[PDB]
Design a protein around this ligand. Structure first.
Ligand SMILES: N[C@@H](CCCC[B-](O)(O)O)C(=O)O
Ligand SMILES: N[C@@H](CCCC[B-](O)(O)O)C(=O)O
Ligand SMILES: N[C@@H](CCCC[B-](O)(O)O)C(=O)O
Ligand SMILES: [Mn+2]
Ligand SMILES: [Mn+2]
Ligand SMILES: [Mn+2]
Ligand SMILES: [Mn+2]
Ligand SMILES: [Mn+2]
Ligand SMILES: [Mn+2]
Lengths: 314, 314, 314
């Protein structure tokens, strides 16, 4: 086995909409823990993190809810490190993507040599000074990059943060909605990425080959997969805050995750931005939840060609 | 010409739902025979097979309606051999997929060296002892494989059966819902298959190249194409009994069939699992029927780049 | 810069439906000129062409509204040449595709060495004698080809026409509804084309590589992109007169245009067949208009990986 350590992170202060807080709930109600155990997985639920209320949390310049988001990630980082110290793959059922700051930070405490694969329609690499929205769920990567140390002002709630990954330790997959400042950072730091243009050009097969070769070429290491459900096309994951057309297909999403699993190096996983209250219909909500579940199950073994135990079936 | 021998097989006792019996009807009402003749095809309709009612047909262990399904295939095998002896490509408009037992058996009587391409979300290779559902439409392949001789118990209605194909004579395309026992059989017999994972990785172009090279590499031979409409994605063929998301696209389905046609070796064809009463709307029914028709027309020449007679059009 | 010269062509007499005349309007109302200026583009609107009414325009044999379509293109050709003489890329917001006769003709007056990329589900290469519908929007290519000189009868309204392109100067992308006579012409003149079969086989990446290499292999030259919105799948562009299933995806359409832009050789562009009154719902209309806009923006720079000015963002 690989073992799994489930972490519910019902948090939404990284952006405007509060429904993202139900992510852990509807995902759990979909039978995630059960379907995982139905597989060759040993699951341990660490519960839903209790994020205290920070009443006094006025914006920092344009940055909104800094202390709340800062504390939420600091809290999450501690939990993730713990489960990692327990020899399990951390699975964060999230609210908004700002939690990746804590998820990747906690993970790196135990595996500083980790590599990150970021599935998303966005790069979430805006800094507290380049952001136009001020929503922290669009800035997690800037806080984690060591090269961006010096460009990140002292934002309340984030003094505990220590950039743990370098520009060369991350690969983007699915980009199609990147701001100008974010694009400048991409090219300036020489960050490796496969926007939808590259997926269209090479095919998901070549994309994954290159992504894994890029991160595991020099040597094998722990992999942290940060999956934003809007990385996929909205026809598959509509109940999300920032949908963008022309996304990855259900198939490509399952292909990305099946290949990650096969490396046997998955160490940390984030399933983020699932907002049940944003589904235009109860059918769109189930579609989003069911797709999110399928993606997660694939990260832990579930193969489309089929699976079977080391037993003589005939 | 190639000539075509149409065989209506309004049968449903291979599974629970009875609406699959209307397959031949709605397909014919869609204008199949007419659209085929509109092409460079010489069509001969052998009518709809009259499957007698077997009132006394209690389950065999967990296997349901064994005698009914057994007689239906025995009946179909005879018809298929006849049309094959008449020098025509047999086209079975089916009910459920259990009829493939009779379709491939009858075909092999006249062309024992045939090769099979099985388009489906499922492998339908469960044996009477490995099945959990007991529905025979999920077991046709086990009855036909010579390697599985000895694992198939004596089921009522199937004493006439003689496995005609070896593990090496078949290729699967589109798999994404395979049971554990079925997966064990796949790997144990070294069966050639392209699950959706392989389609995603290689592209339908490479998949077909390899499939045809695999079956016609050593030498040219008759090809039997067994097409289960659920092999395609449900957004294209919703009116079907066992839909699974992440299927082949309308394009890939047309690509598979266009390439098969171009081999000039198509010998037998099955269009199965079309259930009009399962369409959530009359629009989903037409969508399923129209897609099923398009796939069939492509099997006999209809090319997307266009077609034209050996005449000077200018 | 590249500069852009916008030309509204509210014309519909190339086919039955009149709603195509609103193309320029709804496209403009979508914010096209604004979104373009928001980019690195210098836009100049040349207004909407005033196509006089031709009351006396009885069919020529089977050809309908010949004088009206003939005058509309003659009018458009003059405008296009002008904007080209002004050093700008001509962008024709069209009605029906018959306007391509004038668009490509006017363009060639200033750049006789141009190469054409025709995105469409159809070849629109029927001649006035091979057409079965008589709608001129399905015949534009025959009027422009020099090889077809002698096969084009003297149709009223077209005496000003002079074929400007040879069979070797054009590439088709997206074909899936080609008539027999049209297919004969394709093969007879050895026209280069990528029907949906080739897109499926090679992938859009290889298709574009080959298309551009084919047209710019011997030397660099101006490119005229004639984009029929039905080239894309109807799930993306439903509000169109002749929809055909199995079309290019939103992604492939954006890939085609992003690659064209990157050549830095785009010289002329047509956005045709957008008919707002054909949307089954107001949502299908926005879907068509929004997709049409996205395709156009990509033709002028908008990249999915992101864009940014030559400024230090940090
Ligand atoms: N770049 C926009 C969108 C960010 C979207 C964030 B995400 O990926 O977490 O949903 C912003 O900075 O606000
Ligand atoms: N493996 C399941 C599903 C079989 C589905 C059958 B089919 O492909 O014919 O629709 C069963 O054995 O019952
Ligand atoms: N080939 C048919 C259809 C032409 C469709 C024209 B189009 O591409 O401009 O919409 C006809 O000649 O009428
Ligand atoms: Mn996102
Ligand atoms: Mn994100
Ligand atoms: Mn099936
Ligand atoms: Mn089947
Ligand atoms: Mn067209
Ligand atoms: Mn056209």
């Amino acid at each position: 086995s690989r073992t799994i350590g489930i972490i519910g992170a019902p948090f939404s202060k990284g952006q405007p909409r509060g429904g993202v807080e139900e992510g852990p709930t509807v995902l759990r109600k979909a039978g995630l823990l059960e379907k995982l155990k139905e597989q060759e997985c040993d699951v341990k639920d660490y519960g839903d993190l209790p994020f205290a209320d920070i009443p006094n949390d006025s914006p920092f310049q344009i940055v909104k809810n800094p202390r709340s988001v800062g504390k939420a990630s600091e809290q999450l980082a501690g939990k993730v490190a713990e489960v990692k110290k327990n020899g399990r793959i951390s699975l964060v059922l999230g609210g908004d993507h700002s939690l990746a700051i804590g998820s990747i930070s906690g993970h790196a405490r135990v595996h500083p040599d980790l590599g990150v694969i970021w599935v998303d329609a966005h790069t979430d690499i805006n800094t507290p000074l380049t952001t136009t929205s001020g929503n922290l769920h669009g800035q997690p990567v800037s806080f984690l990059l060591k090269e961006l140390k010096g460009k990140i002002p002292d934002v309340p709630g984030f003094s505990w943060v220590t950039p743990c990954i370098s520009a060369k330790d991350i690969v983007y997959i699915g980009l199609r909605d990147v701001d100008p400042g974010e694009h400048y950072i991409l090219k300036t730091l020489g960050i490796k990425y496969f926007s939808m243009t590259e997926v269209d050009r090479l095919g998901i097969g070549k994309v994954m080959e290159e992504t894994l070769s890029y991160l595991l070429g020099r040597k094998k290491r722990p992999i942290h997969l940060s999956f934003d459900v809007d990385g996929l096309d909205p026809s598959f994951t509509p109940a999300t805050g920032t949908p963008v057309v022309g996304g990855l297909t259900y198939r490509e999403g399952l292909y990305i995750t099946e290949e990650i699993y096969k490396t046997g190096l998955l160490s940390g996983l984030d399933i983020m931005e699932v907002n049940p209250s944003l589904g235009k219909t109860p059918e769109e909500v189930t579609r989003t939840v069911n797709t999110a579940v399928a993606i997660t199950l694939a990260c832990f073994g579930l193969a489309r060609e089929g699976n079977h135990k080391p037993i003589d079936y005939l």
